[PDB]
């Protein structure tokens, strides 16, 4: 798995415009092999719209590096957060729909996302 494909497994869902039930994060955190991962975001936009962020607004990454990029547009995202009834073998998540700007770190000679940093 390249860093780009890890980013797509861990955060992309082009197959929906927005989380489809209060169980979306229970169905997807297990399904993309993240179960617990306390917090995670899926982005409901096409792969090309997410790759286009790597040539938009350059900002600092949380890890101190400086190749992160924040979307000019708000995007549909699902925020997945551990409830208070969730210890790992059975991991329960609160599904929350949001429209937000995203920040990703970008790499490669196809210059593409390899890390989801934040949303704002």
């Amino acid at each position, epitope marked *: 798995e390249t860093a780009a494909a890890k980013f797509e497994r861990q955060h992309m869902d082009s197959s929906t415009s927005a989380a489809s039930s209060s169980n979306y994060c229970n169905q997807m955190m297990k399904s993309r092999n993240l179960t617990c991962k306390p917090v995670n975001t899926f982005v409901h936009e096409s792969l090309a719209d997410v790759q286009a962020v790597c*040539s938009q607004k350059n900002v600092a990454c949380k890890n101190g590096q*400086t*190749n992160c990029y924040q979307s000019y547009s708000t995007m549909s995202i699902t925020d997945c957060r551990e409830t208070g009834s969730s210890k790992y073998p059975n991991c329960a998540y609160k599904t929350t729909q949001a429209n937000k700007h995203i920040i990703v770190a*970008c790499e490669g000679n196809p210059y593409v996302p390899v890390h989801f940093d934040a949303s704002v």
Partner: nanobody
Amino acid sequence: QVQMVESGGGLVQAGGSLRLSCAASGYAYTYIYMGWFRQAPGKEREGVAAMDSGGGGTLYADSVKGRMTISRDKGKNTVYLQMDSLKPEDTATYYCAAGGYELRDRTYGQWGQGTQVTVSS
């Protein structure tokens, strides 16, 4: 589209000086890192110098330390390479690059097309 504009390459005698200029044209914010890379035939692309948009974060490959100065206009998408005491081993294509981190070229996404620098003997 952002366009990397990039001038100053050419042909000088050993010990001579050149100055490379570069601007990211059409970008409305300020790229945090901009730096310079080079590549001789059949050889790895290697980092030469990088600098952040505040004048800080400066970095140099050891083979050019003492002989090339990078500089930028603070808060702007320009970067310059002043090359002094050039050697035959400095003969290479030199590329402008913007928007990445230090001399980690995989982190850079905007690249200029490169100008020849040749140093005769």
